[PDB]
């Protein structure tokens, strides 16, 4: 019977042709971001591929579910990976979900296949049968944490799986995601999260310190603090009174010493407030700093991977403002586990810390977490983008400690000193544009600017004036003061400010003409970065969703929809490149 084998080969030939066409289109799109008419390949092959794509893009709802059935007959892994090769049709997902529900035991690859079974219904919350998720391999922490938010109704099996996946990671990874864990208690109708928190606090040591430092601030709502939240305030009080006292021995002594030292170094800001501006305030601050002594074993809360060595008794300098000041320490870097073991028995640089009283320090944590995630993604991909994630930790209501970047140089001060464009400053600093140092500085500036512009567009950051951008010695540009984001906008949401700030001086740094080669480098770098960062939407969505009930002024209700829309999840690569190029060019002049 030759017809059977004939059709058996024809179907597979058609499917292979479609897959090859899609892959070739993706590769050629990745080759050159712009149109690049100078670069060209074989015309006949491109025309044939385009014709085949046009032919296959017109398929109806039928004759495509049969393709999914055929792929499942070939191999379940291919069927699972099929929706990754984007097809602008919703029947593929429904058919895959039906097939995986019919037989869940055929797949055990967790990073993609779990989401086709976990949500039997998004909000309907019915049919509690055939759900056996007690065998899947562990996945990323955000996926596990997503089960405790408002996205899904509570269920014992999902909570058990979340606890199990959360209990299979090193302590540092859990330390990274501290605020989400404590915020998850709001929707935690059960007590699994509380038991996990108690177990983790009992197991390690620094995790307990981070937990207490975070939970001390979150009990109140206002900056100064006079109104406890009626939702989880009592639960937080019970948890904090339960966790303390249980510890004993050397750990208790370590905790007492650390907290006493922090209180002694913190009370100076409150003490210095009554004295007015003048040299008397400076000398009183110096005397107060000299009063405090150095206690071995202490560590900076913002840098839990270093051991303080000593304090400089002449670096005190309060700034304008609320009585904040600046401090300098001489510190040694050892590590984490070694520091943890050495704290129970008793490469050296200097650091500067800024203590702020009376201001919230929670949005900056989200901003810096997202920046760190983007940096990790870019480093893994293999591109060249430079970002500096300085650390900051809030310890008391309205009280926080902020790290200072080495060799701070504010743009506003340089502008006041010079009253000219940065091009003249760079020419004076390094020399003519024909030297190698100028070329390296330009390359570093482009590297920093591309990533920072992409981030600024993606997160919709407003209020970016000349007094916030920071310039280093090499040439990189660093942003700071991320107070306004998402929806908050000073001035009354006027909206005339562009998404990306591009003045004339920064353009003429790149040659001043749109046809200059450095500008093309910047454009292609931005396009490649935007294309590379796209497939990680779910993690960012979950991270920003889990903290919607903190009542920050930035959130207004519609953030999730706009944030998801700005990622364009139903788009092909070439269309995405066209969109990003258009939106970048629209912001120029």
């Amino acid at each position: 019977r030759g017809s059977q084998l004939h059709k058996y080969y024809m179907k597979r030939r058609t499917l292979l042709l479609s897959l090859l066409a899609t892959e070739i289109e993706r590769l050629i799109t990745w080759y050159n971001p712009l149109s690049a008419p100078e670069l060209e390949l074989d015309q006949a092959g491109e025309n044939s591929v385009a014709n085949w794509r046009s032919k296959y893009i017109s398929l109806s709802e039928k004759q495509w579910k049969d393709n999914v059935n055929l792929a499942w007959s070939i191999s379940p892994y291919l069927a699972v990976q099929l929706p990754a090769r984007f097809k602008n049709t919703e029947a593929i997902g429904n058919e895959v979900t039906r097939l995986v529900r019919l037989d869940p035991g055929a797949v055990s690859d967790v990073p993609e296949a779990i989401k086709f079974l976990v949500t039997w219904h998004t909000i309907d919350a019915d049919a509690p049968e055939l759900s056996h998720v007690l065998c899947w391999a562990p996945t990323d922490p955000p996926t596990g944490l997503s089960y405790f938010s408002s996205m899904y109704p509570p269920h014992p099996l999902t909570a058990q799986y979340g606890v199990k996946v959360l209990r299979s990671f090193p302590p540092d990874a859990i330390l990274f995601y501290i605020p989400q864990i404590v915020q998850a208690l709001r929707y935690d109708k059960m007590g699994y999260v509380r038991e996990y928190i108690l177990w983790a606090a009992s197991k390690s040591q620094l995790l307990a310190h981070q937990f207490i430092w975070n939970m001390k601030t979150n009990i109140y709502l206002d900056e100064e603090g006079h109104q406890k939240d009626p939702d989880i305030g009592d639960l937080l009080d019970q948890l904090v009174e339960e966790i303390t006292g249980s510890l004993s021995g050397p750990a208790k002594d370590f905790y007492q010493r650390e907290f006493d030292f922090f209180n002694k170094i913190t009370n100076v800001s409150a003490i210095i407030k009554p004295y007015p501006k003048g040299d008397e305030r400076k000398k009183a601050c110096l005397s107060a700093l000299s009063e405090v002594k150095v206690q071995p074993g202490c560590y900076l809360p913002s840098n839990p991977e270093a051991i303080v060595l000593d304090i400089d008794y002449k670096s005190g300098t309060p700034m304008q403002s609320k009585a904040p000041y600046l401090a300098k320490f001489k510190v040694k870097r050892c590590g984490v586990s070694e520091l943890e073991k050495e704290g129970l028995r008793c490469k050296i640089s200097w650091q500067a810390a800024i203590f702020k009283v009376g201001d919230d320090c929670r949005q900056d944590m989200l901003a810096l977490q997202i920046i760190d995630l983007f940096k990790n993604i870019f480093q893994l991909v293999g591109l060249d983008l430079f970002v500096f994630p300085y650390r900051v930790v809030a310890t008391a209501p309205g009280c926080g400690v902020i790290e200072c970047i080495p060799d701070c140089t504010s743009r506003d001060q340089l502008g006041r000193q010079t009253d000219f464009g940065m091009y003249d400053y760079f020419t004076r600093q390094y020399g003519d544009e024909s030297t190698l140092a100028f070329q390296q500085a330009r390359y570093n500036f482009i590297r920093s600017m591309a990533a920072y512009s992409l981030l600024l567009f993606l997160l919709q950051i407003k209020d970016r004036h000349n007094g916030n951008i920071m310039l280093d010695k090499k040439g990189h540009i660093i942003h700071i003061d991320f107070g306004f984001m998402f929806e908050s906008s000073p001035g009354g949401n006027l909206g005339w400010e562009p998404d990306i700030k591009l003045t004339d001086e920064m353009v003429m740094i790149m040659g001043g003409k749109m046809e200059a080669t450095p500008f093309k480098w910047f454009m292609e770098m931005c396009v490649r970065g935007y294309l590379a960062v796209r497939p990680y939407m779910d993690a960012v969505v979950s991270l920003v969703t889990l903290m919607l009930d903190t009542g920050l002024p930035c959130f207004r209700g519609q953030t999730i929809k706009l944030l998801k829309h700005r990622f364009s999840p139903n788009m092909t690569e070439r269309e995405a490149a066209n969109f990003i190029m258009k939106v970048i060019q629209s912001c120029f002049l």
Binding site: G105, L134, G191, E195
Partner: protein, 186 residues
């Protein structure tokens, strides 16, 4: 809302009957007790007597020592579509099934906010009823429904070796391999 005198004065009667050895009178009294119309407030005590019957009807008689209730060895449920018991295994399985179905909805869902006694009592009751079910059903060489029942009961077990071991053994005896290997590893 406080039943204090009827419960003792009715239960210790058949307790003394069992002590003396009047088995026929006690089993007839149980049969006529089970024929009453169900009451939502008494469901708990129902559990007890049902389980008690499952304890005695499997260890106190043989096939030839069974008799129809209509002869010696207001409204009452009747009809022709009712399921008339035929053998001890039939009615025993029926009682165990209804008891498990009614006890699944009364679970405490392992609330564990600060207290533990209620969850411990619920877990003990579930364990004993499922052990009775598996010993009753495993004798006939019917394993797959036992695997299904243990899968249904899997909700309670979080750090209990007994339930995991029983489920793994039942799955391996049924014929499935991959799930058996995974539960063995766990």
């Amino acid at each position: 809302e406080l039943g204090f005198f009827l419960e003792t004065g009715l239960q210790r009667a058949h307790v003394l009957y069992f002590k003396n050895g009047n088995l026929t009178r006690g089993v007839g009294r149980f049969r006529e007790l089970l024929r009453a119309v169900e009451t939502r407030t008494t469901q708990n005590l129902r559990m007890t007597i049902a389980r008690q019957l499952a304890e005695i009807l499997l260890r106190g008689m043989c096939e030839q020592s069974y008799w129809n209730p209509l002869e010696d060895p207001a409204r009452v449920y009747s009809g022709e579509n009712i399921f008339c018991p035929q053998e001890n295994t039939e009615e025993a399985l029926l009682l165990l099934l209804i008891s498990e179905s009614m006890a699944n909805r009364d679970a405490v869902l392992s609330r564990i906010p600060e207290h533990k006694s209620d969850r411990l009592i619920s877990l003990q009751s579930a364990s004993v009823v499922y052990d009775l079910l598996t010993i009753a059903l495993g004798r006939r060489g019917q394993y797959e429904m036992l695997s299904e029942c243990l899968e249904r009961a899997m909700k309670f077990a979080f750090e209990e070796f007994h339930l995991w071991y029983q489920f793994a053994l039942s799955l391996m005896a049924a014929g499935k391999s991959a799930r058996a290997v995974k539960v063995l590893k766990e």
